[PDB]
Amino acid sequence: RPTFYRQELNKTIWEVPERYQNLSPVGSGAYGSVCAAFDTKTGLRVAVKKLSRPFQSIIHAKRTYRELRLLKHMKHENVIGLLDVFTPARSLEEFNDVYLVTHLMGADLNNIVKCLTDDHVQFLIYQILRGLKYIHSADIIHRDLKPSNLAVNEDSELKILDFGLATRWYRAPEIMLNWMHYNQTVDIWSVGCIMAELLTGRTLFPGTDHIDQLKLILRLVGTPGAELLKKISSESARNYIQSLTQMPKMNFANVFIGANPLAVDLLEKMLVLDSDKRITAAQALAHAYFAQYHDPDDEPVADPYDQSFESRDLLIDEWKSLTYDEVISFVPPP
Numbered sequence: 049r050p051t052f053y054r055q056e057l058n059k060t061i062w063e064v065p066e067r068y069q070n071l072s073p074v075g076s077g078a079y080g081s082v083c084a085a086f087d088t089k090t091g092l093r094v095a096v097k098k099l100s101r102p103f104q105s106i107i108h109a110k111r112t113y114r115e116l117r118l119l120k121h122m123k124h125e126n127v128i129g130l131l132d133v134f135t136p137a138r139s140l141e142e143f144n145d146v147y148l149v150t151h152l153m154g155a156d157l158n159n160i161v162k163c164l165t166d167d168h169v170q171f172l173i174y175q176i177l178r179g180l181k182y183i184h185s186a187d188i189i190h191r192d193l194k195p196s197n198l199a200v201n202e203d204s205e206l207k208i209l210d211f212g213l214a215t216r217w218y219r220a221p222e223i224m225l226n227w228m229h230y231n232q233t234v235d236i237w238s239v240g241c242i243m244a245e246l247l248t249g250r251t252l253f254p255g256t257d258h259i260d261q262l263k264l265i266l267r268l269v270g271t272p273g274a275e276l277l278k279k280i281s282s283e284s285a286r287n288y289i290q291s292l293t294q295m296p297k298m299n300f301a302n303v304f305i306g307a308n309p310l311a312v313d314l315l316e317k318m319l320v321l322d323s324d325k326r327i328t329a330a331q332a333l334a335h336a337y338f339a340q341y342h343d344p345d346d347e348p349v350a351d352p353y354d355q356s357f358e359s360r361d362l363l364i365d366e367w368k369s370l371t372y373d374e375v376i377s378f379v380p381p382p
């Protein structure tokens with residue numbers, strides 16, 4: 049056990065081992081607090097997230113467990129992964145705080161949209177796909193892909209954060225409609241919204257609520273055709289969709305006027321209404337538009353990921369304790 053030490057950071061008390069010096073705040077919400085820090089052990093500058101109220105309820109105890117499990121598993125250069133996880137507690141008894149350490153990045157991909165040429169787009173969307181491809185392959189849906197959770201370095205290396213746990217502007221139509229069985233291509237939808245915005249400077253679907261959000265989607269990709277109408281289970285949804293004014297599928301080359309044609313082509317493939325026909329992350333990597341970056345032996349997939357716990361209803365002391373085992377078994381990466 050290393051030697052810890054204490055300090056007050058704004059509202060919160062922080063108790064981090066001595067290897068992290070010069071804590072400084074960076075942002076905080078109901079995620080927890082994040083500080084910037086120096087890691088003496090590795091020379092790296094890191095982000096340290098102190099979780100807010102890790103075990104208030106059954107749903108926070110599960111959230112905490114899930115998030116430790118996700119971070120422990122992600123090892124890929126376009127996806128955040130865990131440098132360290134630690135607590136001040138020295139037994140299960142006194143365990144009430146969990147800290148996660150990851151590579152610092154602070155800028156997010158919005159902090160760029162308000163500053164975006166063609167090759168900059170290519171490199172940025174190719175990286176997101178290369179990380180979705182890894183993510184999807186362990187059988188995980190990000191579910192909330194959006195500019196603010198895509199972090200970029202000063203040399204424009206990109207990493208996905210906040211995966212698996214979950215702004216309406218980037219959600220697929222099927223989620224707006226509440227479909228309970230959506231597949232991984234909801235993430236590819238959002239990628240489609242994000243590349244649009246980068247090439248043009250504008251939000252593609254700045255819906256002002258969820259009905260609006262959908263009006264604006266169907267305006268570009270058209271109302272459902274019969275092949276798709278026939279796969280909708282839900283009475284009420286079928287009825288919703290089918291009761292709007294019929295809208296034709298727009299020509300993307302008009303709407304994206306003078307974008308690279310290759311880029312317009314990819315969009316047209318990401319933004320298919322029918323989620324069964326949307327391109328996949330692995331197939332999009334092979335698309336013409338990443339001609340300059342695509343390499344099939346440098347686009348790895350993930351180890352299997354045991355998500356069997358998502359269907360367990362456990363006590364608050366049980367997730368707490370499963371988390372604890374996970375903090376303990378943590379083997380730092382090389």
Ligand SMILES: O=c1cc(C(F)(F)F)c2c(-c3cccc(C(F)(F)F)c3)n[nH]c2[nH]1
Pocket residue numbers: 221222223225226227228272276279280281282285289321322323
């Ligand atoms: O019970 C359901 C409910 C839905 C729900 F998405 F519509 F809600 C669906 C969908 C589905 C998929 C993609 C896009 C759409 C669209 F946005 F075009 F309407 C619907 N496929 N199958 C369903 N079965």
